[model samples]
Target: ACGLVASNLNLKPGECLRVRGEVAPDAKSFVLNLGKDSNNLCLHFNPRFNAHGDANTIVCNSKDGGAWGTEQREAVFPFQPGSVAEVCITFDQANLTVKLPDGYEFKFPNHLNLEAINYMAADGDFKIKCVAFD
Candidate 1:
């Protein structure tokens, strides 16, 4: 995992984040995380290409005190290795909505019930081109 973390961010509800990146050809999976701290993740956005014997799945979950919550999976995986893709994530009080590169959308519950997040990170077999919040 090529881990990259952006800290001290002021991400709040109604804001949107865009992640642009290229997946390594040999990538097994990648993860995007948002939280108050590294150990207390509020969102774990993972895309699996060929990981854990799972094919084409997007899994979402949250972690508190190093313990993970229930995982939510969406089968609309639009990621292709060696190709650049843009993922847009919108934040809200009730849920986090993600728009995949293929224009498919999925939502995950805001299990942490937080109004803002300060830390963001990305890791695994992918090269992040850019990340922007607006």
Candidate 2:
């Protein structure tokens, strides 16, 4: 799939966001991105299913002004191809916390430092079903 996208949102600290999608079979990887836009991301969540010579790894990072920040890696993987996967995220001024389908948490910094994030997207080997803020 080409992926799912949302824009003009108002994702603020203390707000909860939930997302669910179907993972493509034979998928190499996928990413969930949040921030102002593609090149200006506060958080980038990617799960690799054997891509980049990495096996079942979660890579996190942020991009500012077309430059990428320090990268973070996690070993936990709760996603499976050809199945549905869900994620929940909560943001704070310092950072954001992501909950994988298995409830493993991943934290990443908020570099843009905006009170609210206005862009979100899912790309590569997955199709999002819903993006809800509460």
How does each model score on TM-score?
0.92, 0.93
Q: In order, what lDDT does every prediction score?
A: 0.84, 0.86
lDDT by residue (tens digit), candidate 2, 1-134? 34777888887888888998889998899988898888899888989998998999989999999999998898778888889988888888788988875758888877778778788989988889887887
lDDT (0-100) at residue 93 of candidate 2?
79
lDDT of 2 at 55: 90
Candidate 1 clashing pairs, residues 3+ apart or interchain: none
lDDT of 1: 0.84
For candidate 2, what is the total of clashing residue pairs?
0
